[PDB]
Every structure is written in C-alpha cells, then in structure tokens.
Amino acid sequence: TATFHRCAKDPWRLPGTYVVVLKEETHLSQSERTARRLQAQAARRGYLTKILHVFHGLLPGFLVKMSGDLLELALKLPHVDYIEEDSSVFAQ
Amino acid sequence: SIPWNLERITPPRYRLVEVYLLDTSIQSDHREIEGRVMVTDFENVPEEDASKCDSHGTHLAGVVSGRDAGVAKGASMRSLRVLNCQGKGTVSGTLIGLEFIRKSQLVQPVGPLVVLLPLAGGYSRVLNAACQRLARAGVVLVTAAGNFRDDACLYSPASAPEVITVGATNAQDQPVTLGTLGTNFGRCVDLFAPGEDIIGASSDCSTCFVSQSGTSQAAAHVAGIAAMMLSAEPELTLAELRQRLIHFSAKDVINEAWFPEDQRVLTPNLVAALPPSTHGWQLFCRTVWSAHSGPTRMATAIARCAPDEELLSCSSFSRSGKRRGERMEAQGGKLVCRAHNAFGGEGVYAIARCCLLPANCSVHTAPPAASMGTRVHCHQQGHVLTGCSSHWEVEDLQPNQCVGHREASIHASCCHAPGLECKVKEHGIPQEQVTVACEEGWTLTGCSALPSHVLGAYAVDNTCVVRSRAVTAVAICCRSR
Ligand SMILES: COc1cc2c(cc1Oc1ccc(C(=O)O)c(F)c1)[C@@](C)(CC(=O)Nc1nccs1)NCC2
C-alpha cells in the first residue's frame, strides 16, 4: 500500500536522499525504531545509510541518505505511508 | 513620496501577530528592520555550487515590516534560513524549517502566526502535507505562486490547498512577465499583489534600498496585509481571513489576455488591498474550481469547500460542452460539488460557491420526470434557496424552486438563514457569453443556466457567467438583513 514519489522536474531531483513518511498516528518512538530497523536491514545487505533527521510535530517520519536500491525494502517497513525523494526549492 | 505598491494596496477609504520568514540569511541590522527581526539562524541549506547571500531575505523582511517601505510597519518577525547564497534549498530543509516553527510555538505559545514561504519547487506530496498540518495547527501560510509563467498547481508549497498563494502584478495591474520568467497563474492562486519594481531594504548597506520583482515580493505584501488583519481581528479562522483577502481585493483590473486561454477563467482577477477599516455581519462567498476530471468517458470532477465553509451552489463547465451536468451530494457530513463528463470528452470542471454562513443547509433532490420538466423546491417556511444543480444520465438531449430538463435530476441547496434575504436575477439574450450580476452590497451564492447548448456556467466574483456554443444566465443573490 506504501507508494514512492519523486519530483516531476528532473533537474530538481536529489536522488540518494529520501523523506520516509509514516502513517498519521505513528509515535516518535515508532519512527525512531522504523529508522533503526531500516539501517539494520540495509547493513545486512551491505548498504551504508545515514539518518539525517527524525520528524515529529507536523508529520511522523525521517530523512535518510541511502542508495535508491533500498526503496522496495523501505516501502515494506511497518507504519510507512509513502516515500519521497528529496528535491530542490528556489527563491521566487 | 510613496512607493507605488504601498499606494496600490491602500483602499478607496481608509484611516500581537508574528511573521515567520523561511528564506536566505538576512541583514538583521538594516535600519528598516533593526530591533524587530529575530534571526533564529536555524540553518538547513545545500552546498553552494554576505551582501549577495542575504539579498533576497533582507528585501522580503523589509517588504513585510520595513519602517519606511514596509506593508506592516514595525511588525515582529522571526527568520529561519532554508535557502543558500544562490537562493537554493531543499524540500527536506523546508520541512525541518516548518517543523521548527511548530516546535517553537509548542514551547513558547504566542498569538496568531503568519508564515511567509517565498520559495517554490515542483509539486511535493510531503511539502503539501506539512503545510496542511501546520495550517490545521492554526497557522496562516502565505506562499509565492512561482515565477515560471505556469500553472501554480504544479509547484509546492503553492499548490497546498491550506495556504494562501500569491501571484505578481505590476503598476499597470498586469501579470509580471520578465523574459522567460513571469508570474504563475491558475486555480491554485488565491489572488495577486504588487510584484514588480518593489522598493525594499538592500543588504549592500544598513540604509541602502533596492527595487526587486517576483511572486516572493507579491506574497510578502499579502503576509503584511494578513498580519494586520489578524492583529485587528485575532479570532479570524484561516477560512475567514482568506474570504476577507478576496472581498477587500480590487476586482477585474487584471487584463487576462496575458494568460493562456483555458487559464483565464480559472485565475482570480484580484489585486490584494488592505481593508477600509480595522473592524456588522456580512455574507462572504468565493468560487472554488476543481481539478479537470480527465479525458475518461465516465470522468468526474469534485469541488469541495475549505473547513468551516458552506457549499451553497454547484455548477460545471466543459470547453467542448460535452458534459452530463453536476450534482450537490453529502460526503462526511458536508456537501460536495460533483461534475460528470460526456462521451466525446475532453473532461469537465466542478465549480463550487463556498460561503461563510455560521444557518442549517440541506440538499433537496428530484430524479427525472413530463412536459413540465424536473422541479424541486425549498418547501419549508423561512428557508432560502441558495443554488440549483442538474445532472443527466442520457448521453445527449418560481421563488425557492429549481427547474431542470425532463431527462435530468434536479438538486436544490436549501438554507434556514433568518438573517438572510435572497433574490433570483435572470438575464436572457438570443451569443458566446451571457452574464448577470448581483447589485452592490449583495453576494452571489449561485450561478446557473436556464434549461441552446451550454458549455457551462461559473461565478466570477458576484457575476454569473453562462457560456454557449435563447440562452439565460440565472444568479441567486443574498445579503444580510
Ligand atoms: C490543489 O487545489 C487547490 C490548491 C490551492 C487552492 C485551491 C485549490 O483548489 C481546491 C483545493 C481543494 C479542493 C478539495 O476538494 O478539497 C478543491 F476542490 C479545490 C487555493 C486557491 C486555496 C483554496 O481555495 N483552498 C481550498 N481548500 C479547500 C477547498 S479550496 N490556494 C492554495 C492552493
């Protein structure tokens, strides 16, 4: 049921960095456990990952620096609502 | 002596809020803003590939609150850096910035908050969801429509339904267009505001000034207006503030020849202005357009009103005229406006009239009937008819009463509003466009065509527009007693 999204404007995409968005009522403790579970599952497959930030206050989830190869795995993690590849914003 | 843009937002009769800015670094010592801007210097910027670095943010803090060239002179501001020296940021950095604002509020609650987001990226599900969460928490978000001469619905945060999205106009009330760049437009734009040749604080020196252009400058004018409207009336919900910004704007001053043909009608022809006074009850309505249904032979379009607004009418439109009308239907204890496409496509729009009516409304429906056509009425005493809708299944063809074609279902929006007086104004001519307008002081609640082939109908401010390939435009006009 979890889906993946990337920016439609190809030069603005930032592959390698993803915002993992969890289901509405996910507690911060669960977001941290899901980020650690991703890191351990990735390590067992030979992938290095970096949890840059854990979100709470607006939306539950986290920001992860990792190879896109791990996306099918990350989409299977518990509480995952969707995953978005990072993208650029500009002064207007 | 007065910058043109400050005169432009001054209305024809005239006499506690914090503004958060998510932009580049700023020159907090500038005389325009010194002592009134708190630099949090929360930093989340991508690597670059000081007067140049702080140019954008310093000019915008000046547009909002500058002592001499600001909209809301002396307003308190807080700035967060999310854009690098070249004005580039990330969606993730923007999310962290928005989250930091929410955390700051939880730790030290203050009064109403206006968040100015003078930036844009491509449509982002996560950035729009974060704007939604922050608005649901009670914060007002004002965003730049974008400078890409494109539909603002394709950019974020511009496309987030819960924000106020602002387009840019010049001294001639024309959309700003500078080369390959120019203001964004479309149904996701709430209104326009001065966005060309805007004088403001220059970070080159503490007393220096520079003229800049963009939807960022346009959005800073609306953030300044919103901060002042919220200071005078701090209980305003977001829906009440958006309705007031629309109501107090200069109407039909933008030449829409500049926009692509299909975008002209969808784009609000509004230039922001301050209200004539700081502060009985009046009827506020606005038009909400859905996204296009698609090409599908069975395609439908859905238009809904923002939280704490009432849907008073529903119309539909198709450039080809190949449609099966529309219907008002209850969903999650709220009325929605659903429009149906027909065989030959290419799709349709559902157009709702969304009003502030704190009154009990309902839908009265009659299925197809008979030479007398299909009819339904608000039978109950003290009830006002606010809108008529009609839909048909078949591929091809009195006061408080709606009339439809014999092969079509008819829907009536019926409201128990004792403080409201309503009249139905009709205008029929034997023509590609027929219009009928409510008189001054009256608010258009409903717009429809009398049941030869019409493309559709839509309300433009307080004018009902009926487009055809006689033909009668029918307007329902209401006012507070
Ligand atoms: C993606 O669509 C839109 C983006 C923006 C805007 C309007 C949009 O149109 C919509 C939005 C939502 C629905 C729905 O069904 O919930 C709908 F039918 C139409 C406005 C003009 C603000 C506004 O009106 N927001 C609303 N919220 C609720 C109703 S209107 N500026 C910001 C971006």
Side-chain angles (χ1 to χ4, degrees), chain A, chain B residues 1-318 320-342 344-345 347-431 433-481:
Chain A
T1 53
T3 59
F4 173 69
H5 309 277
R6 73 191 200 182
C7 182
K9 315 284 204 307
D10 196 78
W12 295 353
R13 286 175 56 219
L14 300 166
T17 302
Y18 308 89
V19 181
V20 182
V21 185
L22 312 180
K23 291 164 183 166
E24 203 184 303
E25 283 157 70
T26 305
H27 187 270
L28 173 56
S29 278
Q30 302 174 299
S31 304
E32 292 170 350
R33 281 198 243 105
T34 305
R36 294 344 131 180
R37 181 189 178 106
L38 177 58
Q39 288 208 284
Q41 283 184 342
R44 286 190 302 113
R45 291 160 215 262
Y47 289 89
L48 270 80
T49 60
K50 196 172 168 186
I51 303 300
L52 306 176
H53 189 260
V54 180
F55 292 101
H56 82 278
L58 288 181
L59 295 163
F62 52 92
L63 183 61
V64 60
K65 195 184 177 184
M66 75 184 189
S67 162
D69 298 358
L70 296 157
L71 288 167
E72 284 185 304
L73 175 65
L75 288 164
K76 285 175 167 189
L77 294 161
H79 323 287
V80 175
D81 188 10
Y82 60 93
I83 304 180
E84 187 174 316
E85 180 191 79
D86 207 5
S87 66
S88 296
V89 300
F90 306 87
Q92 296 303 300
Chain B
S1 182
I2 299 293
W4 81 268
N5 51 295
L6 300 182
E7 189 62 57
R8 191 65 200 92
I9 67 158
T10 301
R13 159 97 60 158
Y14 64 106
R15 165 64 188 82
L16 59 88
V17 188
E18 290 182 2
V19 183
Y20 265 92
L21 174 65
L22 275 76
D23 203 72
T24 65
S25 44
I26 74 132
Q27 196 211 94
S28 56
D29 288 344
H30 195 103
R31 300 291 172 269
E32 275 291 87
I33 57 164
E34 187 175 30
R36 319 290 292 147
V37 180
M38 194 258 157
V39 171
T40 72
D41 216 278
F42 146 81
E43 218 165 87
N44 210 287
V45 304
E47 60 179 291
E48 287 93 358
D49 56 85
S51 58
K52 190 213 90 192
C53 296
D54 328 320
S55 167
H56 194 253
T58 309
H59 189 269
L60 298 174
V63 178
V64 175
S65 64
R67 282 173 173 91
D68 296 336
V71 169
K73 290 173 167 64
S76 286
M77 299 188 73
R78 297 195 196 261
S79 59
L80 279 83
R81 184 188 195 199
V82 304
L83 303 180
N84 75 6
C85 290
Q86 298 175 271
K88 186 166 160 188
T90 65
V91 162
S92 66
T94 303
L95 292 173
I96 292 168
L98 293 169
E99 178 188 84
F100 180 88
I101 295 170
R102 177 60 172 167
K103 291 178 165 180
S104 299
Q105 178 174 56
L106 287 164
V107 160
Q108 190 58 250
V110 287
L113 286 181
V114 177
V115 174
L116 175 58
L117 287 152
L119 52 86
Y123 173 89
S124 164
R125 189 182 169 176
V126 70
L127 186 50
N128 285 10
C131 291
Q132 179 188 74
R133 298 285 177 96
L134 194 56
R136 283 171 185 238
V139 177
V140 172
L141 275 72
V142 177
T143 76
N147 303 332
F148 307 104
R149 296 193 72 181
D150 200 1
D151 191 331
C153 303
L154 310 180
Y155 302 84
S156 282
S159 63
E162 306 79 10
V163 308
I164 293 152
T165 303
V166 192
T169 47
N170 64 24
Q172 284 59 57
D173 287 325
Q174 296 326 115
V176 182
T177 311
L178 301 162
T180 192
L181 305 179
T183 183
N184 270 358
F185 44 72
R187 72 182 185 90
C188 294
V189 173
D190 285 272
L191 77 178
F192 289 78
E196 187 175 301
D197 180 28
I198 308 297
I199 200 81
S202 170
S203 57
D204 284 353
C205 96
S206 89
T207 55
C208 292
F209 287 79
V210 68
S211 166
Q212 287 185 21
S213 299
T215 53
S216 276
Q217 278 74 26
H221 281 78
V222 174
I225 298 166
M228 289 206 281
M229 287 175 164
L230 283 168
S231 203
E233 298 179 286
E235 296 177 276
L236 290 177
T237 63
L238 167 62
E240 293 176 328
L241 174 74
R242 185 190 319 280
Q243 292 262 13
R244 272 154 183 81
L245 285 170
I246 293 171
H247 175 79
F248 293 121
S249 282
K251 323 268 196 313
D252 311 313
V253 294
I254 311 167
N255 170 37
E256 289 185 291
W258 299 89
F259 306 125
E261 284 180 29
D262 302 312
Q263 297 282 10
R264 295 171 184 167
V265 168
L266 286 151
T267 309
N269 194 319
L270 305 170
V271 176
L274 280 154
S277 294
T278 48
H279 320 84
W281 187 85
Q282 205 218 294
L283 179 65
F284 295 97
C285 290
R286 73 191 177 97
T287 301
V288 169
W289 285 73
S290 67
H292 192 253
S293 66
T296 346
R297 270 81 165 108
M298 67 226 75
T300 57
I302 301 153
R304 309 179 305 165
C305 297
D308 69 75
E309 279 185 323
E310 305 285 304
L311 195 142
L312 293 202
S313 66
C314 173
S315 69
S316 63
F317 177 81
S318 157
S320 56
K322 301 171 185 179
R323 50 178 199 108
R324 289 201 313 269
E326 73 294 307
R327 60 199 224 92
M328 283 177 288
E329 42 162 281
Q331 261 188 234
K334 308 279 176 287
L335 310 182
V336 308
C337 173
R338 191 184 301 258
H340 304 276
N341 191 31
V348 298
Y349 286 104
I351 309 127
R353 195 79 167 154
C354 301
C355 313
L356 293 173
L357 198 58
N360 308 301
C361 299
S362 60
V363 178
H364 291 220
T365 297
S371 56
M372 277 261 94
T374 317
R375 282 158 202 253
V376 80
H377 64 99
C378 305
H379 49 270
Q380 201 43 46
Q381 291 284 305
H383 270 76
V384 295
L385 172 66
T386 67
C388 297
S389 288
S390 189
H391 85 280
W392 48 103
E393 316 279 330
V394 57
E395 316 272 85
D396 198 43
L397 69 140
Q398 264 86 81
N400 276 4
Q401 189 197 65
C402 296
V403 187
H405 186 274
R406 57 208 278 182
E407 298 174 67
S409 296
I410 193 73
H411 316 277
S413 166
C414 300
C415 299
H416 165 68
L420 238 52
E421 177 190 6
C422 303
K423 299 187 181 177
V424 182
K425 188 181 174 172
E426 306 170 337
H427 191 257
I429 54 169
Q431 291 283 341
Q433 178 168 299
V434 53
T435 70
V436 67
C438 294
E439 288 305 320
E440 261 206 352
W442 294 74
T443 306
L444 178 64
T445 70
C447 170
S448 69
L450 262 187
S452 192
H453 182 67
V454 297
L455 266 49
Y458 47 83
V460 179
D461 186 33
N462 290 306
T463 298
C464 174
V465 177
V466 168
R467 293 264 302 272
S468 57
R469 173 164 277 104
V471 186
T472 310
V474 184
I476 306 176
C477 307
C478 304
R479 61 162 186 196
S480 179
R481 287 195 194 271

